[PDB]
Ligand binder design. Structure first.
Ligand SMILES: CC(=O)N[C@@H]1[C@@H](O)[C@H](O)[C@@H](CO)O[C@H]1O
Ligand SMILES: CC(=O)N[C@@H]1[C@@H](O)[C@H](O)[C@@H](CO)O[C@H]1O
Ligand SMILES: CC(=O)N[C@@H]1[C@@H](O)[C@H](O)[C@@H](CO)O[C@H]1O
Ligand SMILES: CC(=O)N[C@@H]1[C@@H](O)[C@H](O)[C@@H](CO)O[C@H]1O
Ligand SMILES: CC(=O)N[C@@H]1[C@@H](O)[C@H](O)[C@@H](CO)O[C@H]1O
Lengths: 148, 131, 148, 148, 140, 141
């Protein structure tokens, strides 16, 4: 009610970029949390639960590909981009043989933890290859920060 | 409260008229239109519009209707395909079976493959007639 | 201690349905949270952390299959089932060749976020294909809502 | 700020063991949480959010392998190790054929839930095969407990 | 400091409470000094395997059909389900708790040096011309 | 507004505190105006690479053996581990931070149009009789 809070979701309309939105049902940006330059900006020193989900998808495996998902902190106290939470996925171990069916695949990734953050710290939630993100339905791609 | 109205959040005394589909609750009635790329499909008192869905190209889907302010995107399949619902909401477009070495007993439908029977010598596996 | 709270787990004894239970060690249903018709029902307006895990399993890949996991809100303010959190998995890209070993596979999915909910809102946590769920051990399948 | 809190991360320097650390940037051990014998020890009765992530990796698939990740409670009220949260992964369904490229694979697992815990309860976060853990970068392997 | 078999009442350092026996759980703590602890029997599909003061019984485990396991003993109120393998199989423990049933090696082109055991495959040796890899005798 | 190289004390808008040098971390803020900042050296296996007021040192990264990486420089107190590839390999960046070591192409039945670089494979071209498909020269006929 008074606690700074964000639960933002991906723009479905822009392809090949991961742009976060707040003005939607079951999304939140309140009590000081700010969304600036696609980053969530903490209004106050404190402990925050920080989390993000992405869903990647593809049509068969013409190529080997690595997918990454990373929540980063750009801290006032340390002016470099630094991983808070990170993961990697490898959806396509063997290439689909020439002529065979290109069967759809899906790879979700969840990241989540509690962090001491400082007023003005910038958090970003990013993937290396947005072309693979799945924006078909709600609740598949999101990024949240909540003050505990 | 009567049908079509709701109890004001900060006052049990007051009944408020719900927002019409296509709109959302800006304030307890102050209903505003859903912005591009969002919608509401029922009468509501919801603080923001829902995000539109998008057709699944990976499932071979095609768009029948784009998102409007009161209707979510509508997706389907092409000619000679049917929808296989993996779930309530997820479906995949597959090609209708041709019932080779057999006979089309019932033609392909929107959400249902062709029903084949097989000629002497064959039986059905993966809805294809095999020896 | 006073905060509404649920951490429910799957019934091991019913196969081919995902039925939630509270009366077990390390499970919770307290302070107003209600479990009715397999849905968690919120006692009060507020911010809630909402989450669920499922573990799917199978014995080789006789067929292509897609597995889904979805946490939904049926809100008093909007009487339609709406995705809060959702994901998809594709365990079986190529079929196991005829005669080859049917090696076990496992697919966990985690979903989690913070949401503003209203008194009377119904939350459900569901999969499309419960036959594939892994009930062998504790802590593999669960569904939680906690008021922050 | 006053709430017991831990967000601990893996020692990069010891290979083939999962040893947790607190004295690093974006890690936490505060307000009564203790880290003893690689286990997080709760200072007070209450509700805690408990979570862990691991990232496993390998170089091709010379062998079938199952990877597990488990958060356990050793409770004062029940002196056995018991699963709170658990999952399994199967990265290598088919062996890499003799002569073919050994392509890297990655498997993240996230586990997370809310639990009523008691003063003195010991929580551990473990995998069966630490040789496969990915310690290359920050944010890939972690274990957290926070009092709500 | 309460004696063996008892525990400190959560809301009163003065009172010691007797623990519940395996097969039961804590419905309620002693209401006061010298009073009985209210322990109730575990409901079907749950258990407790040690003396405890736990507010609910643990969920029984289930044999892993995907691992080829079979049930030796069903869950009782004081004992978790017990699972194992079939004739001519051994358990390979992937972890403390997860195990997979595999077929014992026959040591073809070789010799059974030590027979298959519950948790351990046959130990082979190999005839001239062969050596061991994946505990099968292959050509050298 | 504190001057360059200094920061506002978290618990007191009145006090400006001098930042810690790379190689060190903030053990403790100035206790008061004009006072020294307590910066201590990063322990083994950690580092800081810029001036900071951070409460702990960052964890060093580790070379990715699964990517074929090799260590160029071990972690020092002011510099993270530096990783690269071997002779006749290049780095393919899957992301800002993740990269995989691959072998440089030899452009057989062709010519090296641009030589292998640190972060980029050899660019091949073909001459008469062949054409280029995925950086390899295939016969036209
Ligand atoms: C499984 C499969 O290969 N489906 C084919 C597709 O590849 C092809 O381009 C087209 C022909 O009509 O549509 C489907 O029949
Ligand atoms: C055996 C026969 O009478 N006719 C053909 C056969 O040569 C063909 O390969 C098969 C494929 O399913 O379909 C049958 O109609
Ligand atoms: C991996 C493998 O070959 N498993 C075999 C199974 O296919 C066979 O039918 C039976 C023999 O009795 O049980 C196992 O030995
Ligand atoms: C993908 C691939 O085959 N890489 C090769 C490896 O097999 C070979 O033995 C060695 C020679 O330098 O290293 C790489 O060139
Ligand atoms: C096809 C041709 O004219 N010349 C050679 C051929 O002998 C060789 O086996 C192959 C290797 O890529 O291609 C060319 O180098």
């Amino acid at each position: 009610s008074d606690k700074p809070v964000a639960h933002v979701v991906a723009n479905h309309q822009v392809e090949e970029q991961l742009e976060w939105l707040s003005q939607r049902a079951n999304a939140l940006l309140a009590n000081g949390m700010d969304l600036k330059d696609n980053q969530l900006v903490v209004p106050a020193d404190g402990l925050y639960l920080v989390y993000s989900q992405v869903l990647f998808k593809g049509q068969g495996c013409p190529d080997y590909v690595l997918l990454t998902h990373t929540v980063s902190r750009f801290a006032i106290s340390y002016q470099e981009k630094v991983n808070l939470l990170s993961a990697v996925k490898s959806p396509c171990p063997k290439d689909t043989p020439e002529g065979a069916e290109l069967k759809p695949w899906y790879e979700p990734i969840y990241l989540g933890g509690v962090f001491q953050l400082e007023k003005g710290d910038q958090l970003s939630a990013e993937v290396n290859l947005p072309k693979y993100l799945d924006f078909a339905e709600s609740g598949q791609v999101y990024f949240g920060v909540i003050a505990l | 409260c009567p049908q079509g109205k709701y109890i004001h959040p900060q006052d049990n005394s007051i009944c408020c008229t719900k927002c019409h589909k296509g709109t959302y609750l800006y304030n307890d009635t102050d209903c505003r239109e859903c912005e591009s790329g969002s919608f509401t499909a029922s009468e509501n008192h919801l603080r923001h519009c829902l995000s539109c869905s998008k057709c699944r190209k990976e499932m071979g889907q095609v768009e029948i209707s784009s998102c409007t302010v009161d209707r979510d995107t509508v997706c389907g399949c092409r000619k000679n395909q049917y929808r296989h619902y993996w779930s309530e909401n997820l479906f995949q477009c597959f090609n209708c079976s041709l019932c080779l070495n057999g006979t089309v007993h019932l033609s392909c439908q929107e959400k249902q493959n062709t029903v084949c029977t097989c000629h002497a010598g064959f039986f059905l596996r993966e809805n294809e007639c095999v020896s």
